[PDB]
Amino acid sequence: PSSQVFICLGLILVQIVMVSVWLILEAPGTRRYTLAEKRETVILKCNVK
Amino acid sequence: PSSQVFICLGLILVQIVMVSVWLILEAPGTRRYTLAEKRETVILKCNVK
Amino acid sequence: YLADEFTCMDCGSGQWPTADLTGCYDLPEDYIRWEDAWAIGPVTIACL
């Protein structure tokens, strides 16, 4: 009842650290990804591929 | 072993939700505090009054 | 966009020349929306 939650939150915190460095290196933003072949359109994609 | 932790994380998550929606409404940043009466004084301030 | 009469200029991929031949503007954006179709199915599935 205690160590199960502890291990679950440990794995969740590993994921949290990974996603935290992911967003720190890749702060939120929008790229205006246009179809240069077609143009006349913009995709407000997120700032990372 | 279970309900103590559940309630504690419930309160912690309530606070986290409140602070997260508050940063959503009032996104973080830095402002320049300058004393017009004094001048030549620029202060880097967390964007929250 | 012909900024000068003797000189047509491309506003780039990000921008686009206005139809009034007066300048360049940020090109219109596209994204998936809830207007008529496509998104309604997955949205209802998630709600269910």
- How far is the alpha carbon of B40 from chain A, nearest alpha carbon, in Å? 32
**Method for structure elucidation:** cryo-EM
Print burial letters for A3-33: b (CB count within 10 Å at least 16), e (below 16).
eeeeeeeeeeeeeeeeeeeeeeeeeeeeeeb
Q: Look at A36 and C13 and tell me if their CB atoms are within 8 Å.
A: yes
In the block, tokens 């720190």 appear at A24
In C, minimum Cα distance to A40 occurs at C27
Q: State whether residue B49 is helix, strand or coil.
A: coil
Please state, in angstroms and rounded to a whole number, the distance separating the CA atoms of residues A37 and A32: 14
> Is the Cβ of C32 closer than 8 Å to some Cβ of chain A?
no
Overall resolution, Å: 3.9
> Is the Cβ of B29 closer than 8 Å to some Cβ of chain A?
no
Please state, in angstroms and rounded to a whole number, the distance separating the CA atoms of residues B8 and A6: 13
